[PDB]
Symmetry: C3
Subunit: 280 residues, 3 copies
């Protein structure tokens, strides 16, 4: 089995490579310098020559505020990229996994969101990622769309940010009026490889179990590291940004629950495992 | 030569399809839950990979409408995940899929016969879960047929048998007159399913019998045809409330059939008479 | 060699595609209704199974916009069922499908150039039936190209020829100035169609010429180019009412071209001048 990973140097790309080490698979990791997924001719040629069995697309323009000003570039990476990969995959009979986002929803939900709830993106990042999902489904029947959120792993992320700020500050203000679930790439990668394995095609939410605010997330980070910093809960209005962020983006892993099982862990368990890895 | 898997094959429609395929040049593989549980992805994949059917017709459903409201997870598993599993597994072996669906995808606020190009707006768990099943089938397999039906009777429990049993044990009955649709025989539905497969006339089709009436009118005609002496009284929906919202108006126009190879269904009274005659053998 | 079936091949675009494919290394099979009626499923299936094209380009449509309002069944057959039939028949033989569509899928209430990611909301029979055609094509064949165009002129009847004739027989004309879009030559549309096929750049594309004007501005430029002495007066839509709702604002941005392999269309006045020059040979 030949697996192409795009955006392979990112957080999730790295964790998938790691979980696939020693398995009976040939992994082809690419990032932008090896394969620019926005270029249709390049993508078609690559797939026709390499003939992967699966493509996992971890490439994205994830700077959320920058997407508002770089709408064209967001569409190219977040939407056209997936379109190109899905079709090129189809031409060689390959499956596609497309990683997506909780920003497809408007944030006005009051309870955990399922895969059957209606999308309504209020941001360029959300809109462009959604159009990426729509292309993937339209162009390749052998699709998996895996939506995630608040993702941390081998790369820049909120955990590393908090740690670095916390070491240089005596107090921090962190939003308490935005809720979701911190997710480790370890859990997301396990799920990605699980549905591939089962051929459990479709759209899946995949965040860790539980719920909290960014404030709660920060407090647990500092509890776990021992860093002495006073965190103060604040509101979204106090520190405004170019992109609209959802008040409530808790995803229910419903499709996993209804099929072969929600194997993700409680968010604090995954986070402890990650902090341990870092302090090593 | 042609190999046809039927899921939910012991149900009303499943039985009628088996019957209409007897003696045809096809290998039929009837399954119900104890042979193939369609909610189980691994079991479904393995079954398709080994049997390699050319067509799957999915007649399995969680049709207890009121019970779906209290069993939402189970309704999703049977009414949506099942179809998903069958559509993908079919796609993996190059098979076509027929997915039977429902008028409950609509909100019941229509004022004239509803076409396949009208907008869906399910107000029930049953309708919502059946709709998501349609969505999956189309997303996962380009060789699809979605056939929506309603008020279905045949070889199984149904309104006709219920009315007959009540009517024999009661001097009068109240039946809703403010809900309208069209009584449909599995005979007509099954002829249509097999017709579109035969033509490779892919897409979404409405398939109810011709004409229009209320459940009250349906009951009155049942008792006229059986000779059962029972006074039926028309009533309203508010008088006898249920857990699931039921459409006021769920008349489906068989527009895609009309626009393509012909609406071969019969007027509802004709199909019903043929059914009652079969019963009183 | 590559085999390209063209349906509606005698129409404006069908003729231009044939012309741009002359001398290329492709076998072109032009058909119009008398050779292949696309609304007939059995005929369409048989044709594809025998000819096995690699690509179908569908240029056939019921484009009489006002007449669609009174011929809704026929519009559905040609504008939706035809594409459905072609998309599925193509799929069965591994063929790609290009489906030509319309700015009438939008409601006309936009205030800036409309992209392929904007929401559809047809207010006419023509628009609604063409939209359903799009939906079928994408559902039934993953190797699809939907190319939306507007205000199209070429080798057939069109606004350019109409204006020229009226202008020769009239001293003044009233032309609507409150409906805006962009005049589009089949030369540019055909180049785009053949470009995306060549690239395997699947998806939905807008393809009108660059720029923006009203029908009034279009007329004024036509008469400037031909030298015809006629006074054109700008008017409103309310002054001269028609059965079909027309969009106030139907400027399509060719955004998918811009974001992918390039918007090769020309400025509308350049395309139009080339066309008028061809006409006055
Ligand atoms: N980061 C988060 O909190 C969330 C992430 N996601 C999604 O999860 C997935 C993984 O995110 P991370 O691993 O954190 O992303 P990351 O930002 O750590 O890495 C993304 C990779 O994509 C690459 N890329 C950019 N343009 C490319 C192109 N033209 N061709 C090929 N590669 C290109 C980047 O160079 C980078 O290596 C993405 O699809 C993202 O949208 C969704 C919701 C939240
Ligand atoms: N009966 C009616 O008035 C209406 C029926 N329909 C649709 O018509 C279709 C056929 O209806 P009927 O033949 O009357 O249904 P039925 O209730 O007579 O039979 C359905 C079958 O589903 C089977 N089933 C349940 N779970 C299963 C599983 N996990 N795996 C395999 N089989 C399973 C049952 O065992 C049963 O044999 C269904 O899709 C239903 O949604 C739609 C609207 C109304
Ligand atoms: N005319 C315009 O301003 C615009 C055109 N379009 C679209 O552009 C495309 C091309 O339009 P034109 O080239 O102007 O069309 P045209 O009207 O010049 O030619 C259309 C063709 O449809 C054929 N046709 C009708 N029924 C058929 C059937 N059953 N089977 C096979 N062929 C059949 C006709 O005989 C004719 O050759 C169409 O898809 C149309 O909807 C969209 C927006 C605007």
């Amino acid at each position: 089995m030949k697996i192409l990973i795009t955006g392979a140097n990112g957080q999730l790309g790295r964790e998938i490579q790691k979980q696939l080490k020693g398995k009976n698979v040939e992994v082809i990791p690419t990032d932008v310098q090896d394969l620019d997924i926005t270029n249709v001719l390049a993508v078609n040629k690559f797939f026709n020559e390499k003939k992967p069995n699966v493509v996992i697309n971890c490439a994205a323009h994830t700077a959320v505020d920058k997407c508002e000003e770089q709408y064209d570039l967001a569409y190219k990476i977040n939407a056209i990229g997936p379109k190109n990969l899905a079709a090129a995959a189809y031409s060689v009979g390959a499956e596609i996994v497309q990683i997506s986002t909780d920003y497809v929803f408007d944030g006005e939900a009051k309870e955990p969101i399922t895969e059957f709830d209606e999308v309504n993106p209020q941001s360029a990042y959300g809109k462009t990622k959604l159009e990426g999902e729509n292309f993937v489904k339209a162009l390749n029947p052998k699709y998996y769309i895996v939506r995630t959120a608040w993702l941390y792993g081998d790369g820049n992320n909120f955990v590393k940010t908090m740690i670095n700020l916390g070491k240089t500050h005596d107090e921090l203000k962190v939003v308490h009026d935005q809720v979701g679930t911190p997710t480790s790439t370890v859990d997301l990668a396990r799920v990605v490889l699980k549905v591939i394995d089962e051929k459990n095609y479709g759209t899946f939410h995949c965040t860790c179990k539980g719920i909290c605010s960014w404030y709660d997330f920060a407090v647990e980070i500092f509890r776990l590291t021992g860093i002495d910093v006073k965190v103060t809960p604040c509101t979204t209005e106090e520190f405004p940004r170019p992109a609209k962020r959802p008040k409530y983006s808790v995803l229910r892993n419903y499709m996993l629950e209804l099929t072969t099982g929600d194997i993700t862990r409680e968010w604090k368990e995954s986070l402890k495992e990650y902090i341990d890895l870092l302090q090593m």
